[PDB]
């Protein structure tokens, strides 16, 4: 079984960094010191 | 009461536009992550099913 | 000539048991879940507890540890779209 619901709700599969649009990843990397975002997504294991 | 940030305008506009793509979203989970239940015990009971 | 008594106690805590094949902690999503939906079926369960007598009625309080998450999307100005989900219980 490969029930896709877990992928949809970010229960398994990819971490937050991958599936997000590249521009968002770049922006988050840019200004992490004074405006945090790295904990608004699941990135499970 | 509410607090804001002194973000530069066009930067904020670009961020907001990049934040409305259906591939972008929001995930959240409770740190407890469980379901609660409780059951009764009459006085001087010792076995529970 | 006397006799001895041993006791132990520990407050502020909970009794926890993990659903692992070896009880170890090696991942948010346990293997046994994937295996028992690879043992895809419907099961009914029972539990039995033995305790010590108490003066007055009390409560056995239990927690089934499960996933529960929720999503949020705003397409346009001033609109919120949200969808919740917990795994075993809805």
Experimental method: cryo-EM
Query: In 3D, which of C23, C33, B36, B21 has the Cα closest to residue A11?
Result: C33
**Sheet of strand C68-73, all strands in order from the earlier edge strand to the far edge:** B27-29, C68-73, C81-86
Token pair, residue C65, equals: 């540890």
| Residue of chain A minimizing CA distance to C35 | A1
Q: 3-state class of C71 per DSSP?
A: strand
In chain B, count H helices and then E strands.
1, 3
Alpha helix positions (H), chain C: 31-37
Q: 3-state class of C72 per DSSP?
A: strand
Query: In 3D, which of C73, C44, C28 has the Cα closest to residue B33?
Result: C28
Resolution for this PDB entry, in angstroms: 5.0
CA C50 to chain centre: 19
Length of chain A: 45
Cβ atoms < 10 Å from Cβ of C12 = 4
User: Do residues C87 and C64 make contact, with C-beta atoms less than 8 angstroms apart?
Assistant: no
| Residue of chain B minimizing CA distance to A23 | B18
**How far from C33 is each of B16, C11, C30, C42, C49, CA to CA, in Å?**
38, 31, 6, 13, 24
Round to whole Å and give the CA distance between C33 and C40.
Answer: 10
**Phi/psi of residue B29, nearest 5 degrees:** -140, 145
Q: Which residues of B touch A23 (CB under 8 A)?
A: 18
Residue from B16, B17, B18, B29 whose CB has the most chain C CBs within 10 Å, to mutate: B29
Please name the member of A1, A12, A45 whose beta carbon is closest to the beta carbon of C40: A1
Round to whole Å and give the CA distance between C82 and C73.
Answer: 6
User: Do residues B33 and C67 make contact, with C-beta atoms less than 8 angstroms apart?
Assistant: yes
């Amino acid at each position: 079984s490969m029930m896709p619901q877990w992928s949809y709700m970010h229960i398994s599969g990819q971490d937050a960094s991958e599936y997000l649009s590249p521009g968002l990843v770049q922006f988050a990397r840019a200004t992490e010191t004074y405006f945090s975002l790295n904990n608004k997504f699941r990135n499970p294991t | 009461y509410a607090t804001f940030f002194p973000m530069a305008h066009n930067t904020a506009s670009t961020l907001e536009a990049m934040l409305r793509n259906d591939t972008n979203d929001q995930s959240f989970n409770d740190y407890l992550s469980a379901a609660n239940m409780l059951y009764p015990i009459p006085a001087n009971a010792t076995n529970v099913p | 000539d006397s006799i001895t008594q041993k006791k132990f106690l520990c407050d502020r805590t909970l009794w926890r048991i993990p659903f692992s094949s070896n009880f170890m902690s090696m991942g948010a999503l346990t293997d046994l879940g994937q295996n028992l939906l690879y043992a895809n079926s419907a099961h009914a369960l029972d539990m039995t507890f033995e305790v010590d007598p108490m003066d007055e009625p009390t409560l056995l309080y239990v927690l089934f540890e499960v996933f529960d998450v929720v999503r949020v999307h705003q397409p346009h100005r001033g609109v919120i779209e949200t969808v919740y989900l917990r795994t075993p219980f809805s």
